[PDB]
């Protein structure tokens, strides 16, 4: 699952719905541990 | 992450040459639909 929000509001241009920022979990190099890492995506990339 | 400002991708074309060439291609293709008829250009329909 992705915990995610619109990135950078109060940018009232044509660039508003673009570029959500999202967050998740990822397995580490070694098997049991977990890792959290964070990224940007476009609004056509990912659906709720 | 984004260094700089926020903009979007846009694509410039030359207006007059574009009109010239499309008038050329419609002046061509009037041979295949009668010399007297009215032709119209519309946008995309839809779908995916």
């Amino acid at each position, epitope marked *: 699952t992705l*915990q995610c*929000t619109n*990135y*950078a*509001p*109060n*940018l009232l241009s044509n660039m508003r719905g673009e570029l959500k*920022q999202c*967050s998740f979990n990822m397995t580490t190099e070694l098997r049991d541990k977990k*890792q*959290k*890492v*964070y990224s*940007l995506f476009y609004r056509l990339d990912v659906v709720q | *992450d*984004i*260094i*700089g*400002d*926020i903009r979007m991708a846009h694509c410039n074309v030359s207006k007059a040459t574009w009109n010239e060439t499309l008038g050329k291609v419609v002046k061509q293709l009037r041979k295949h639909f009668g010399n007297n008829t009215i032709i119209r250009f519309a946008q995309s329909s839809g779908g995916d």
Partner: antibody
Amino acid sequence: EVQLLESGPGLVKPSETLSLTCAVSGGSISSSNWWSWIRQPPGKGLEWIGNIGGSSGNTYYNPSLKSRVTISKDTSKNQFSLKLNSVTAADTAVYYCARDSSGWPWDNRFDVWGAGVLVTVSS
Amino acid sequence: SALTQPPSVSGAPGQRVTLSCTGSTSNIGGFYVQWYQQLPGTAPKLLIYENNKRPSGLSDRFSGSQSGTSASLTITGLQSEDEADYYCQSYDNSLSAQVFGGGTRLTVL
């Protein structure tokens, strides 16, 4: 919140290996996002220091302080301390430590609630 | 940096004062920011719900602001016992800069 975060001073005045600590009692290390550090010269506004990880693996730092200040943590009992090297400037300043209590502080920030008390050196 | 009302503002129990940080498009376009500071002699810490709204649980029932390409706070209502001072915080798009230059000093009659 439950909190006893306290520091251990050091006088590194004509010398270049600054290393001071802090450690809390309440919660745990991976009970928030990380813990942060801010610096203030006595009369100036604030100077922010980039941050650590903790319940994470990624670090952050500060321009005008690049290749200059190294941050770590110890995970024995709430130690997250610093070994900043080669102090040269006249930045005889106060410090504080901070909690996140945050949402996604992860592009930049949701708000820094850092309590602290008095993290003071005049070195 | 940020342009953040040098402390020549005139505080009094008439509550006519404003707080206005000037920000760039990369400054104000980052996010909502703050008004959450307190007295010197101590780590000046209040909390706000990052803008224009009521903070965590309760800190005060007295605030309220907007944000154009701007960081307002016109504050009006008799709270002269809380004669405190304030600062800023922001995220501008210097390289990854959780950065500001805030500072206030206001007064009382």
